Amino acid sequence: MELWVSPKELANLPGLPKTSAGVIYVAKKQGWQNRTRAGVKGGKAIEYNANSLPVEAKAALLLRQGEIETSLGYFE
């Protein structure tokens, strides 16, 4: 499993501030396994590994994830 996340998506969990500015700034206070992707924004964005987020965000995370997709590229 992986389920990565984006700063704009973290800017809504309680444990995390309501603005990515605080999440990215706080990201330095720890540095959750964040993968870069030269396509979700600029030549180098900053994703966040959901498994690296604490528990307070892990709970509220999958919470606002209601409805998303059924199954695909999952090779069954």
Swiss-Prot record:
Induction: Expressed in the early phase of the viral replicative cycle. Expression of early genes is repressed by viral Repc (latency) and favored by viral Ner protein. The lineage of its organism: Viruses, Duplodnaviria, Heunggongvirae, Uroviricota, Caudoviricetes. It comes from Escherichia phage Mu (Bacteriophage Mu). This enzyme is structurally similar to and performs the same endonucleotidic reaction as retroviral integrases, RNase H, RuvC holliday resolvases and RAG proteins. Belongs to the mulikevirus repressor c protein family. It is found in: Host cytoplasm. Responsible for viral genome integration into the host chromosome. During integration of the incoming virus, DDE-recombinase A cleaves both viral DNA ends and the resulting 3'-OH perform a nucleophilic attack of the host DNA. The 5' flanking DNA attached to the ends of the viral genome (flaps) are resected by the DDE-recombinase A endonuclease activity, with the help of host chaperone ClpX. The gaps created in the host chromosome by the viral genome insertion are repaired by the host primary machinery for double-strand break repair. Responsible for replication of the viral genome by replicative transposition. During replicative transposition, DDE-recombinase A is part of the transpososome complex. DDE-recombinase A cleaves the viral DNA and the resulting 3'-OH performs a nucleophilic attack of the host DNA. The 5' flanking DNA is not resected and an intermediary structure is formed. This structure is resolved by target-primed replication leading to two copies of the viral genome (the original one and the copied one). Residues 1-69 form the HTH Mu-type domain. It comes from the Viruses. Homotetramer. Part of the transpososome complex composed of a DDE-recombinase A tetramer synapsing the ends of the viral genome and the enhancer element. Interacts with target DNA activator B; this interaction brings DDE-recombinase A to the transposition target site. Interacts with host ClpX; this interaction remodels the transpososome for replication and is required for the flaps endonuclease activity of DDE-recombinase A. The catalytic domain contains two distinct activities, the cleavage and strand transfer activity and the flaps endonuclease activity. The N-terminal HTH Mu-type domain 1-alpha is responsible for sequence-specific DNA binding to the IAS. Two adjacent regions 1-beta and 1-gamma bind to the ends of the viral genome. Contains a D-x(n)-D-x(35)-E motif, named for the conserved glutamic acid and aspartic acid residues and the invariant 35 amino acid spacing between the second and third acidic residues. These residues coordinate the metal ions required for nucleophile activation. Each acidic residue of the D,D(35)E motif is independently essential for the 3'-processing and strand transfer activities. This is DDE-recombinase A. The chain holds residues 1 to 76 of 663 of the full protein.
